[PDB]
């Protein structure tokens, strides 16, 4: 539609003698310095912020957005043509590519029209160009990127689920013959290419020479390559679906930036892949910019209710409304819901590990409450204990069609990166998997004695476990070595243990009947005038609370020490199946840590600490 | 086959007759 020469001249003038208002509205050759650095081979990747263009060239930005690859190539050629005028001296031959390039330029000059008698543009680059998505286009959700946006520069958010090791990919393939003496170039764009056999060079075909060609890796151009799969953020996926994955390919200096399980912002060109009725093709994303979130590291005044309104009576009372009671049990969930993302800047890495255990699955249908835990909590991902077999963590051999050689993958634990981990049906796990859990308990010490796999898994989420009872409710008459069937030492490592017995408590038994009767009566599941409210309001208020970062006082710990003393007498006299130890002191300080976040005073706080002690006493010795 | 004479189909026998 439009002449590419005019646009090339426009971008050249834009870069060379056209000005911006970045530094106090004064031109300072912003891109000029980077171009100079490129001339001296001191900067390898060049980024073109589309925002800078959009400040004073909206039509160019619109054209670029409507078609990405063509303008990308045009900019690359323009930068190539800008280089020679910034040459000041002789290249110091940094690498093999520079040496080959300077010999090629010397040979070109020595002997100085067929369109096929010149160096390909990509071979003489020594620079890579990329685009940063303009802020004008709002980020899109992966499910909404359909075939209709092919070829348009889009930006999507997600979480890395499968990244391969860095490997070299070949852009220009160099072939040399023993008769011609010249260099034959085959640019390669598809992931697969066909090596040449008989050179189609005009010299040989005219001379009917042997034309035997030998591929070499000396003067070929190589670029970095990676393969990653990215999955939608669980927080915004509709409840009625599951997140979908879209393939992203990253090349050049942009590599080695994404880490597994991390939130990434990706901007690239949506292009099809051929694998060679009708013409079918797949899709991928050639990224141009990967920026992680900063959070991955480590108007009246009446609009808030922080100190005047108690968080216990409003926040807790709107959590898990389908559950028929267990308000004391409900409180611990809030501590689990809080977790240990908010930690003091003092190196307390253990604070974020809250491995709570629940025994008894048929009890009061507590399997349901897991979903509410994932949905309300931010930075939380839904996971299932029984989502795959034991092969899901190690490596095995299965048939595949699309891709995957020497597959390396993780389980549910790795999938939730520093979030909320949900594990169901602990009993049905095989013996080997149980050891895999136990090695997680030892603070990320996953050792594998298999020849091919020697990885070190990084488990930093919060682990919630639900366990079925031993083929029936516990019976007191059974003494030790029989009463508990799951290994006791395994339970010992867990910080909190909860078990619910459906005792014939006629006072409580009537309460269950009353609530199930009000079902099928109206649409208000929480009849105590609690409205479900929008999820937007709750999340926004919670986020600003993280920024305060209160710190508990160390002096108060002296009070706690007495609690261990009285516990010892009970532990020795009871001789019960459950047993505790100094781990309670380990737990208590962590447990007290979260509770104080409601009252951000931290000068004198006694009730908050005491309640955590009272929580332990309520569950044990219920008789 | 080489209730004591059941290998893998302890239902098919009930559907036939005991014939020598």
């Amino acid at each position: 539609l439009k002449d590419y020469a005019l646009e090339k001249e426009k971008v050249k003038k834009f870069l060379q003698e056209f000005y911006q208002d970045d530094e106090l509205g004064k031109k300072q050759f912003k891109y000029g310095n980077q171009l100079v650095r490129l001339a001296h081979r001191e900067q390898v990747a060049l980024y073109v912020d589309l925002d800078d263009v959009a400040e004073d060239d909206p039509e160019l930005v619109d054209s670029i957005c409507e078609n990405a690859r063509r303008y990308a190539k045009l900019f690359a050629d323009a930068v190539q043509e800008l280089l020679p005028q910034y040459k000041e001296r002789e290249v110091v031959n940094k690498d093999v590519l520079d040496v080959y390039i300077e010999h090629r330029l010397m040979m070109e000059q020595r002997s100085r029209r067929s369109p096929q008698n010149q160096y390909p543009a990509e071979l003489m680059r020594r620079f890579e160009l990329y685009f940063q998505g303009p802020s004008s286009n709002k980020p899109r959700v992966i499910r909404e990127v359909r075939a209709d946006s092919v070829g348009k520069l889009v930006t999507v958010r997600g979480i890395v689920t499968r990244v391969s090791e860095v490997k070299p990919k070949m852009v220009v393939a160099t072939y040399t013959c023993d008769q011609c003496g010249a260099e034959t170039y085959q640019p390669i764009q598809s992931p697969t290419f066909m090596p040449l056999i008989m050179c189609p060079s005009q010299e040989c075909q005219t001379n009917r020479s042997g034309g035997r060609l030998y591929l070499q890796t000396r003067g070929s151009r190589f670029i970095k390559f990676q393969e990653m799969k990215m999955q939608e953020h669980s927080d915004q996926v509709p409840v009625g679906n599951i997140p979908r994955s879209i393939t992203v390919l990253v090349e050049g200096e942009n590599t080695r930036i994404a880490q597994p399980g991390d939130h990434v912002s990706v901007t690239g060109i949506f292009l099809p892949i051929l694998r060679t009725q009708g013409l079918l093709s797949e899709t991928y994303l050639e990224a141009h910019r990967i920026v992680k979130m900063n959070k991955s590291e480590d108007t009246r005044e009446e609009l808030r209710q922080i100190a005047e309104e108690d968080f216990y009576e409003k926040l807790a009372a709107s959590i898990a409304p389908e559950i028929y009671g267990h308000e004391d049990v409900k409180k611990a969930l809030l501590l689990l819901l809080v977790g240990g993302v908010d930690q003091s800047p003092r190196g307390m890495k253990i604070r974020g590990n809250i491995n709570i255990c629940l025994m008894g699955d048929p009890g009061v249908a507590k399997s349901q409450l897991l979903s509410y835990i994932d949905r309300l909590a931010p930075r939380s991902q839904y996971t299932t204990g029984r989502g795959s077999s034991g092969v899901g963590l190690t490596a095995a051999v299965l048939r595949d069609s699309v891709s995957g050689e020497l597959t390396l993958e993780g389980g549910a634990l790795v999938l939730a990166d520093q979030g909320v981990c949900c594990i169901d049906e602990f009993d049905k796990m095989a013996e080997a998997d149980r050891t895999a859990i136990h090695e997680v308990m030892e603070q990320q010490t996953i050792s594998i004695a298999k020849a091919g796999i020697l990885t070190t898994l990084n488990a930093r989420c919060s682990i919630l476990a639900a366990a079925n009872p031993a083929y029936g409710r516990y019976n007191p008459r059974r003494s030790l070595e029989q009463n508990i069937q799951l290994p006791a030492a395994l339970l010992s490592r867990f910080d909190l243990l909860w078990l619910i017995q459906d005792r014939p408590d006629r006072d409580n038994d009537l309460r269950l009947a009353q609530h199930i009767t009000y079902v099928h009566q109206h649409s208000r599941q929480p009849p105590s005038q609690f409205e479900p409210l929008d999820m937007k309001l709750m999340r926004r208020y919670i986020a600003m609370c993280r920024e305060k970062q209160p710190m508990v006082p160390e002096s108060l710990a002296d009070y706690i020490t007495a609690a261990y003393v009285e516990m010892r007498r009970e532990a020795w006299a009871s001789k019960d199946a459950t047993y505790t130890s100094a781990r309670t002191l380990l737990a208590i300080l962590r447990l007290s840590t979260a509770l104080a976040r409601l009252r951000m005073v931290d000068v004198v706080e006694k009730e908050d600490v005491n309640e955590a002690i009272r929580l332990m006493e309520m569950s044990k010795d219920s008789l | 086959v080489f209730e004591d004479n059941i290998d893998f189909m302890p239902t098919i026998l009930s559907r036939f007759d005991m014939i020598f």
């Binding site: 034991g390 095989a430 080997a432 | 080489f2 004591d4 059941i6 290998d7 893998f8």
Partner: protein
């Protein structure tokens, strides 16, 4: 352990039970989806 598949057959013979019994029970309890049958499915898939 120590009561593996290569020796359990001889135990029946020690109990004056011929090879007829092993088909009726031993060969039929593993087809039930016993953990011992699943133990061979995972541990001995390539180790043998």
């Amino acid at each position: 352990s120590q009561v593996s598949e290569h020796s359990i057959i001889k135990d029946f013979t020690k109990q004056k039970y011929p090879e007829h019994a092993i088909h009726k029970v031993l060969q039929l309890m593993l087809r039930r989806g016993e953990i011992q049958h699943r133990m061979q499915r995972k541990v001995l898939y390539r180790l043998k």
